Design an enzyme around this catalytic site. Sequence first.
Site, short mmCIF file in Angstrom:
data_model
loop_
_atom_site.label_atom_id
_atom_site.label_comp_id
_atom_site.label_asym_id
_atom_site.label_seq_id
_atom_site.Cartn_x
_atom_site.Cartn_y
_atom_site.Cartn_z
N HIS A 62 -76.21 151.47 14.87
CA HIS A 62 -76.27 151.49 13.38
C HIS A 62 -75.22 150.53 12.80
O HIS A 62 -75.43 149.96 11.75
CB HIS A 62 -76.07 152.94 12.79
CG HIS A 62 -76.78 154.02 13.53
ND1 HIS A 62 -78.17 154.21 13.39
CD2 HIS A 62 -76.35 154.96 14.40
CE1 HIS A 62 -78.56 155.20 14.17
NE2 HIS A 62 -77.47 155.67 14.81
N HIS A 92 -65.51 151.15 10.47
CA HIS A 92 -66.76 150.41 10.64
C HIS A 92 -67.04 149.68 9.34
O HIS A 92 -66.40 149.93 8.33
CB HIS A 92 -67.88 151.33 11.10
CG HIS A 92 -68.13 152.38 10.05
ND1 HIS A 92 -67.51 153.57 10.02
CD2 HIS A 92 -68.92 152.34 8.98
CE1 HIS A 92 -67.86 154.24 8.91
NE2 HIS A 92 -68.78 153.50 8.28
N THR A 196 -72.39 158.54 4.43
CA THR A 196 -73.52 157.69 4.00
C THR A 196 -74.53 157.46 5.12
O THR A 196 -75.53 156.77 4.88
CB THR A 196 -73.06 156.35 3.43
OG1 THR A 196 -72.49 155.58 4.51
CG2 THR A 196 -72.03 156.53 2.33
#
EC number: 4.2.1.1
Length: 258
Positions: A62, A92, A196
Amino acid sequence: HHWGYGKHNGPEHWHKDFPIAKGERQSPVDIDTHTAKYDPSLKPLSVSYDQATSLRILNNGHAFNVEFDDSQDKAVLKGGPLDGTYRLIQFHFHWGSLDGQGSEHTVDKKKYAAELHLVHWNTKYGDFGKAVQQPDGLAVLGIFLKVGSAKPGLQKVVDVLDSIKTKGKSADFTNFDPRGLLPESLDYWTYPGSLTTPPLLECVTWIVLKEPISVSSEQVLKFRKLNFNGEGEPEELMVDNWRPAQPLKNRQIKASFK
Ligand SMILES: N=C(N)c1ccc2nc(-c3cc(CC(=O)N[C@@H](CC(=O)O)C(=O)O)cc(-c4cc(S(N)(=O)=O)ccc4O)c3O)[nH]c2c1
Ligand SMILES: [Zn+2]
């Protein structure tokens, strides 16, 4: 048929496996700068990263996570809206296919090229897994990226991406100093929200810096060479791994600055 950011598994579909995607405190949101209110009772933010110990960088399918040793109280976030001490576990990014999109939060509907998330967990819950089950379990420091001058402190991250191209790959990533990713000013907006990505848990105090960092076009072009897919699978470039802004609902965004 796992969640992702593709035409058939992207954010509009998440609610089916994770109904909290339509909940009361989802992230990200649009920050309306004319509606956010200056809160003079917010304390100055305390970012203490001098003893931060990075361990590893992982392509999780992801994004990529730079992971820290969180077994002791070294790299901590405190102050601002926070009660108590929050320990750095990973950072990230989320980024776009082109410079005009990529950020999760928006500012007066402006999308930045990318967004850095430094994730910290509340030490009064003992571990990360327990912390995400609490409304005040995580503090995520969000930092916008715009394309301009290179960020020297980002280049060590850019230079290892070739070695973690595909899902499941990792590489040793010791001695990385996240202080090199911060802007000059720690002025911020804050609001209560969520992860999120699935499972979209409503456990985050969001702290979003007003000042973006500048990265170069060459630096983000290397993000966009990563793959969502595993080794030996059809190539799907890791781009547009951002969730769009969610309804604010019964929330106030507070500013640390006049
Ligand atoms: N350092 C470690 N030992 C360690 C071990 C396990 C960990 N799991 C996560 C992790 C998972 C998750 C997801 C999670 O809950 N469970 C996973 C996996 C699972 O438990 O089955 C899932 O359901 O996909 C999220 C974050 C994380 C993500 C964001 S964002 N912007 O939404 O992408 C923001 C903050 C976040 O904390 C994670 O940090 N970070 C971890 C770190
Ligand atoms: Zn994130």
